[PDB]
């Protein structure tokens, strides 16, 4: 794979879950 596609595992599991959590006290 590529380090970037490893960051797809990282960054997408950062952005998406956090929006789902942080939408509550950090709504934007």
Swiss-Prot record:
Expression across tissues: Isoform Alpha-1b-1 and isoform Alpha-1b-2 are expressed in the central nervous system, but not in skeletal muscle or aorta. Expressed in the cerebral white matter, cortex, hippocampus, basal ganglia, and cerebellum.
The scientific name of the source species is Homo sapiens (Human)
Record gene name: CACNA1B
Name the family the entry cites. Belongs to the calcium channel alpha-1 subunit (TC 1.A.1.11) family. CACNA1B subfamily.
Which locations, inside or outside the cell, does it occupy? Membrane
Q: What is this protein called?
A: Voltage-dependent N-type calcium channel subunit alpha-1B
Quaternary assembly: Multisubunit complex consisting of alpha-1, alpha-2, beta and delta subunits in a 1:1:1:1 ratio. The channel activity is directed by the pore-forming and voltage-sensitive alpha-1 subunit. In many cases, this subunit is sufficient to generate voltage-sensitive calcium channel activity. The auxiliary subunits beta and alpha-2/delta linked by a disulfide bridge regulate the channel activity. Interacts with RIMS1. Interacts with FMR1 (via C-terminus); this interaction induces a decrease in the number of presynaptic functional CACNA1B channels at the cell surface.
Disorder named in the UniProt entry? Neurodevelopmental disorder with seizures and non-epileptic hyperkinetic movements: An autosomal recessive, complex and progressive neurologic disorder characterized by severe neurodevelopmental delay and developmental regression, epileptic encephalopathy, postnatal microcephaly, hypotonia, and non-epileptic hyperkinetic movement disorder, including myoclonus dystonia, choreoathetosis, or generalized dyskinesia. Disease onset in infancy or first years of life.
Q: Its biological function?
A: Voltage-sensitive calcium channels (VSCC) mediate the entry of calcium ions into excitable cells and are also involved in a variety of calcium-dependent processes, including muscle contraction, hormone or neurotransmitter release, gene expression, cell motility, cell division and cell death. This alpha-1B subunit gives rise to N-type calcium currents. N-type calcium channels belong to the 'high-voltage activated' (HVA) group. They are involved in pain signaling. Calcium channels containing alpha-1B subunit may play a role in directed migration of immature neurons.
User: Domain annotation text?
Assistant: Each of the four internal repeats contains five hydrophobic transmembrane segments (S1, S2, S3, S5, S6) and one positively charged transmembrane segment (S4). S4 segments probably represent the voltage-sensor and are characterized by a series of positively charged amino acids at every third position.
Extract the coiled-coil ranges from the record: none
Q: Please indicate which part of the intact protein appears here, giving the first and last residue numbers and the full length.
A: 1242 to 1269 of 2339
Write down the superkingdom of origin.
Eukaryota
Q: How is it modified after translation?
A: Phosphorylated in vitro by CaM-kinase II, PKA, PKC and CGPK.
Membrane spanning stretches: 4-24
């Amino acid at each position: 794979k590529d380090i970037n596609t490893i960051k797809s595992l990282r960054v997408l599991r950062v952005l998406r879950p956090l929006k789902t959590i942080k939408r509550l006290p950090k709504l934007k």
